[PDB]
Paper text:
GqqA strongly interfered with N-acyl-homoserine lactone (AHL) quorum sensing signals from Gram-negative bacteria and affected biofilm formation in its native host strain Komagataeibacter europaeus. ESI–MS–MS data showed unambiguously that GqqA hydrolyzes the amide bond of the acyl side-chain of AHL molecules, but not the lactone ring. Consistent with this observation the protein sequence does not carry a conserved Zn2+ binding motif, known to be essential for metal-dependent lactonases, but in fact harboring the typical periplasmatic binding protein domain (PBP domain), acting as catalytic domain. Structural data together with a phylogenetic analysis and the enzymatic characteristics implied that GqqA represents the first example of a till now unknown, third and novel subclass of acylases.
We report structural details for the native structure at 2.5 Å resolution and for a truncated GqqA structure at 1.7 Å. Crystals of GqqA and SeGqqA grew applying seeding within 3 days and belong to the space group P21 (GqqA) and P212121 (SeGqqA), respectively. Therefore, the crystal structure of SeGqqA was solved by single-wavelength anomalous diffraction (SAD) and refined to 1.7 Å resolution. The coordinates of the solved and refined structure of SeGqqA were suitable to solve the phase problem of native GqqA data by molecular replacement. The loss of this domain, which obviously appeared by proteolysis during the crystallization process of SeGqqA, resulted in crystals with different space group and cell dimensions, compared to GqqA. However, the obtained crystals were of higher quality. Due to the fold of the polypeptide chain in GqqA the missing domain for SeGqqA is located entirely at one side of the protein and has only a few interactions with the other domains. Superposition of the native GqqA on SeGqqA main chain atoms resulted in a Cα rms deviation of 0.76 Å, indicating that the missing domain of the SeGqqA structure did not change the overall fold of remaining two protein domains.
Author numbering:
A (entry chain A), B (entry chain B): 3 to 85, 171 to 281
């Protein structure tokens, strides 16, 4: 799949344009569904997938919390497209052997679980607060067939192998289970545009 | 609109099935879009709308954070449907004159904003933890054209006029902006033994 990026939709669509902006040069592979987009990467028909993840006003985005780790994928980038509604996307590859070399400008997406008791999330976030680490996304998910715990996806500033994030995530681990890095990637300059 | 419930999708869809489960004997009103679904309730073509909100495995749901309050709607119920995957839905009406009467067995859905600074969410959740209040959903959203604050949706056990939630919500108002009760409704028996 070298230099192919899959997206959900048709040629010329906004998602196609997003691919062409985010990954110049690359050949885009239109797919009808989210599952097909992830399959193309899993199966080697494409190197990357472009997945819508947030909208500022309106939209339906795929829920990736289960499917993306099941497919063995990993987030290597983000993209913002302002159409105003702003659509944010994740860019995902097959899982790399190593994380990017640490330095400035990174963000991290992770998954973790906490139990369904008051203050459970709060205890897991305490290290981040004390370390002065800024989060930028947090979303809860039901567990199938259970209400005794909740899964979370979190986007957070920094790189997991560097301060200040590393020590803060050590504390999150103390008060959660099933901690998994779903991506490490450069934060878009869109976030700092005047 | 009396005894009519609108949903997004084609007839026969899982949302249609959810309507038949949740409101037996009601007439269902298929709508192509999310905007059309909420408009039907706003405009009086339907008394309720069935809106998908979460999936345990996978799915696409409408993002309600902006359009639902704009349409003057209020969440009066929840529903769960098992299809390997569980889909949860909100059931929304035109905003009532008064909240439901305080009593046992309620949950509350709210919106609020916090600043994009470390520990801002953590400070807002401290009161709920101190009060022994259990949350069951939390989801962040982007504000259009600003990265200085983040919008949240929260589902929490209790009724806003009854302890322990009442005092906790009062505290939350000193740690957030634009705090809004979006719904107060019975917790489904699906969370216990249905
Ligand atoms: N950035 C703020 C608010 C926030 C929390 C979590 C997700 C998104 C925003 C914080 O880290 O507390
Ligand atoms: N119920 C736990 C975990 C949780 C937090 C937020 C949303 C969903 C679950 C708490 O209140 O801390």
């Amino acid at each position: 799949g070298e230099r192919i990026i899959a997206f959900q939709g048709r040629p010329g669509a906004y998602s196609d344009l997003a691919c062409r902006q985010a990954r110049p040069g690359w050949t885009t592979l239109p797919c009808q569904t989210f599952a097909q987009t992830i399959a193309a990467v899993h199966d080697g028909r494409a190197e990357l997938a472009m997945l819508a993840c947030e909208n500022s006003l309106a939209g339906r985005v795929p829920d990736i919390h289960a499917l993306l780790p099941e497919a063995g994928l990993f987030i290597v980038g983000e993209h913002f497209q302002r159409v105003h509604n702003t659509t944010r996307f994740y860019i995902a590859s097959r899982r790399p052997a190593t994380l990017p070399p640490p330095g400035p400008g990174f963000m991290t997406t992770l998954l973790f679980r906490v139990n369904n008791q008051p203050g459970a999330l709060y205890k897991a976030l305490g290290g981040l607060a004390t370390a002065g680490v800024n989060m930028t996304r947090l979303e809860s998910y039901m567990l199938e067939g259970s209400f005794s715990a909740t899964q979370f996806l979190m986007d957070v500033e920094g790189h997991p192998e560097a301060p200040p994030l590393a020590r803060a995530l050590d504390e999150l681990s103390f008060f959660s289970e099933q901690q998994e890095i779903l991506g490490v990637y450069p934060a878009s300059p869109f976030r700092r545009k005047p």
